[PDB]
Amino acid sequence: FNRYPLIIDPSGQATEFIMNEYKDRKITRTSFLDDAFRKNLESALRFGNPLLVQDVESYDPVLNPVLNREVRRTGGRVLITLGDQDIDLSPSFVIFLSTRDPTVEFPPDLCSRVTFVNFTVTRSSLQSQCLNEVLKAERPDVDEKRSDLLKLQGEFQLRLRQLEKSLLQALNEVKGRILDDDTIITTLENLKREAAEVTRKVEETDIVMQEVETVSQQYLPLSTACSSIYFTMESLKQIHFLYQYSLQFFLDIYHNVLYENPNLKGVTDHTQRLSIITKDLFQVAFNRVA
């Protein structure tokens, strides 16, 4: 970003992502509704700490010089005039603005001063979430297998990238010729053998990932129906202002139909359970929404 971002995430996942990314930099989460926002802002400005500010619909115009970067450089310092007092702006300072309201309107000046980052729910992401949820509910062993497989694939690809980079670095850092020093040959052989072993591990994880995928194909229509149901619920606001339904509402409906379903008390067949789950999904969605 060039302009400081203004995050819009009703689910709050972007906020926790930002807090986790800047945890090592001691990010402070504050709000415009706090009477002590000026003190926290000045501390972050002076000491260069990352700052996350919520309730941006109550935006404090004291941030206008900070968002506009109206700095004055003199004597090697970077002076920012926060209100009436000058503060030395540390170059490590960063501020993130956030809100949970996707329908909030912003004045044009604020729209100019910030970079809008909108975290909306897509059909593909919702389908993936619903498929993972039903896999965990119905086939927990397959779910944990898939999670371990994903972790292994990530680690293996990271190892492959590191090995390739180290091989290039070793070939580039030689002070002369390869056979002049035996240690270079030792390192190259070690890197190549590690790459071969990791490639074999990648192949075996790939085949087990294939079986994991082929056992999860049965639940794909349920995830598609879930996405359709939610995006029908989200569009119910077009016919009445009162039909405001969040993603957590549909997720609670899904959790109820998966785990709190009476019709799954003694049924053990996977196909029968899936059919019951779909039918009760439609029924419970109608019952709760209507």
Binding site: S31, L33, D34, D35, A36, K39, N40, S43
Partner: protein, 322 residues
């Protein structure tokens, strides 16, 4: 041991010494039989007063810790320090769950309101601030003191807060509407400490000062103010009049409080002595050579017969009352 007449006695029970700097304040846990002491080494050490053994140190403050307080349940501990921050401690897990900035200078007092949902603090920037426990937001700012505010204390129901300052006055505020109910200016020096009167002492105060029974039945909240002119004054918040002045301390009064039975007044000062006041006759009953240096604070257990005093000699003493 009359359940509302014990007073501390000269032979100390324990002399706990683990702090590396003068002990600022000492408080009792409302529920558990455990004790908390704040000191100037930025540490909050926790002691057991039945057997006098150190338990654990609560660190995280950068500068000297000036005040500590418990909520009614005893599950949260609020501490303020010289580094301009207020920390809320989960006393079950002993981790700091929230740090609150916003004061412009040394924060010298902190108190959790009786409902337990708000924290009131006084600082050197001449302001008193209110903080939500759940969110940590500053929600109110009581301005009006002309100097460093030294203490803030809410009354029993939390509708009133009293404060003392270097401006030699004591102000009683209204929590709901921020107005200054009274301004108690009779001390000839800086007011160090304040304390509210428990309801168990209302009748005793009324019949000791000769105050006639009001038609309401509520005598009106009573307040105390120890100050650096070596005197203790009892006030009537409703009328703003000083009911009595307690003379006898040889130096600046540092802490003052009532006996839980509301029959005596316990105070400590920099004259190295802890004094028990019989405000019935406006005289001092017992004088204890408490510490070998200035005595900074005292606390009196609500039910158990124990008195604890911190001091600048880095020692915390527990007194059996008999």
């Amino acid at each position: 041991r009359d359940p509302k007449e014990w007073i501390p006695r000269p032979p100390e029970k324990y002399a706990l010494s683990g702090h590396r700097s003068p002990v600022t304040r000492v408080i009792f846990h409302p529920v558990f039989s455990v004790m908390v002491s704040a000191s100037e080494d930025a540490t909050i050490k926790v002691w057991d007063y039945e057997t006098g053994d150190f338990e654990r140190t609560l660190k995280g403050h950068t500068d000297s810790v000036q005040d500590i307080s418990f909520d009614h349940s005893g599950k949260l501990l609020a501490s303020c320090s010289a580094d301009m921050t207020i920390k809320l401690w989960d006393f079950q897990g002993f981790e700091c769950i929230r740090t609150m900035h916003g004061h412009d200078h040394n924060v010298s007092s902190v108190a959790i309101m009786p409902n337990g949902d708000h924290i009131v603090s006084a600082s050197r920037d001449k302001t008193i601030k209110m903080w939500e426990v759940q969110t940590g937001y500053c929600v109110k700012t009581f301005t009006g003191h002309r100097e460093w505010v030294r203490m803030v204390r809410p009354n029993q129901d939390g509708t009133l807060i009293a404060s003392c300052s270097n401006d030699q006055t004591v102000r009683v505020w209204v929590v709901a509407t921020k107005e200054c109910k009274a301004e108690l200016r009779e001390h000839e020096h800086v007011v160090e400490c304040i304390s509210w009167a428990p309801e168990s002492s209302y009748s005793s105060i009324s019949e000791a000062t000769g105050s006639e029974t009001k038609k309401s039945g509520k005598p009106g909240p009573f307040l105390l103010s120890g100050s650096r002119d070596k005197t203790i004054k009892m006030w009537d918040v409703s009328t703003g009049m000083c009911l009595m002045t307690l003379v006898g301390h040889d130096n600046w009064v540092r802490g003052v409080l009532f006996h839980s039975g509301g029959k005596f007044i316990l105070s400590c000062a920099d004259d190295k002595t802890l004094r028990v006041w019989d405000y019935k006759n406006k005289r001092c009953m017992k004088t204890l050579n408490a510490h070998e240096h200035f005595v900074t604070s005292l606390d009196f257990h609500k039910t158990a017969p124990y008195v604890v005093t911190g001091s600048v000699d880095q020692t915390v003493k527990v007194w059996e009352c008999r």
